[PDB]
Amino acid sequence: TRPTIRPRNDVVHKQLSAFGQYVAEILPKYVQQVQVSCFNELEIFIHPDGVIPVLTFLRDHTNAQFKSLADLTAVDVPTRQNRFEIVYNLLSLRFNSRIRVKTYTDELTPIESSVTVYKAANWYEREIWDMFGVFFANHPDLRRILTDYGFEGHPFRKDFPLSGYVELRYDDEVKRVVAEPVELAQEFRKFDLNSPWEAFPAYRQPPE
Amino acid sequence: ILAAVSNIAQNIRLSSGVTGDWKVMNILHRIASQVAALDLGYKPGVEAIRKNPPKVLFLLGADGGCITRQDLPKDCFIIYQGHHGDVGAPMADVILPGAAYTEKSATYVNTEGRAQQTKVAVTPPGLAREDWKIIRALSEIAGMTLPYDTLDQVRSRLEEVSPNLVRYDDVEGANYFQQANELSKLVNQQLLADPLVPPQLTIKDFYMTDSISRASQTMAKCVKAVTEGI
């Protein structure tokens, strides 16, 4: 257990659990769940309507003052009714801590923009709009950031194909770069890698 | 023989009574396409062709050699549509390449009466096409075009002809044994004094049965192994 196993820190575990207690107590209206992982990471699951309040609290409260927004991303889970899971990672330099706030949405429900709370979100939300198609309400300028001009679709969705639907080549007849339906000389080879025996009994699910 | 077996089943039913839903009578088929063809109203056997020889003959994958050109008049237009060159291909005037069971999403009916559908794993080689698509294209070319254009539409028509062909895992059926038993008593054809011998006498007759089996080198190896041990 000593050499090849990652050591556990329980002091940070208790501190993060107590702060989850504190945050869940102050904001019962929006906080839906608080979790602490075994590698000492604190997550708060909130109702979407509380994106602006909770974040503001975490930025402005004296005991929290999470004054840095490290990252803002989304995860696509097609099996959920609310498809997209929005993740905010915040850093507190005053207390040398990190926190995670997660909410959810679907293809048609917008989310309040947090640019007022964090100026850094301006581009991040654009990427979430570009890659996942999640609309953010009250954004100073929401447009595509990463894909090509006029690119149809949101590639980071699970149902979007790996190679897309169109490809570009230069045509001499029209004397310009044109887009055509994608064709591949060699098809991407799909590998079925998952083993038919479970690896981790701790994560076993109810027998359905 | 069918009348005798139905009589045995009738005796069993009228002696033991109606035990419930047991369905004593059973017919064991050996052809994948037989039950579907019977469900669609085809005439079993080739008696009609011998009785009234046609001028145009459509061989839809028929390789049993039951009908040859000696059984047909001259200038007979034989059309073969299939996937292997076998008994029925060299006698054809036009050959239409079709798809095999691994190359189409097609419906086959079990000996139980259970309908199932295959899935496309590969695509037909060369210029080979799906069989119903070939027939539909031919109908359009002749001007007497068919009212269905996709696979779902032809399966809707299939449901119209026989609705049980679109229930893809249900084996439940209705027993009408007594009606068929009553109808079997009208004719009284006499049995033949010939012993019942199956065509499948030994293991060596099992490997090559259809066109795909005959074209397989593994089955030829198996036959050569069972004929001489070595």
Binding site: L108, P110, Y149, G150, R176, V177 | R129, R136
Partner: protein
């Protein structure tokens, strides 16, 4: 009820007026686009293309989907006006290198293995 949240419009009337204003803007912008990008198409051709693009989504009855389509159309128009798009991006709407794929049964039967 379905308990759904709006983006901009409450019903289909607000969505339709937004669609109409976006169509007005595109109709106004087409000649300027033709002059700036030095396109070899006519203004009438470009307006037909705009009309066809709008009519492709004429079947939508959800105000939320209509609002999102209008938002995407505004982004496309902003890219076109600011000349962020190049001539290639504008001309991709016309598909001048793609041979016409036939639709009837016999042509599909003659060409390939798929419907």
């Amino acid at each position: 009820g379905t308990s759904v949240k709006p983006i901009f419009s409450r019903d289909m009337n607000e969505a339709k007026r937004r669609v109409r204003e976006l169509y007005r803007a595109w109709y106004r912008e087409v000649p300027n686009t033709v002059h700036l990008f030095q396109l070899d198409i006519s203004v009438k051709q470009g307006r037909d293309k705009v009309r066809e693009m709008f009519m492709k989504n004429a079947h939508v009855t959800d105000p939320r989907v209509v609002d999102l389509l209008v938002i995407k159309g505004k982004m496309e128009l902003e890219e076109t006006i600011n000349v962020w798009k190049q001539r290639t991006h504008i001309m991709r709407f016309f598909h001048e290198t793609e041979a016409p794929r036939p639709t009837d049964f016999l042509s599909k039967f003659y060409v390939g293995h798929d419907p």
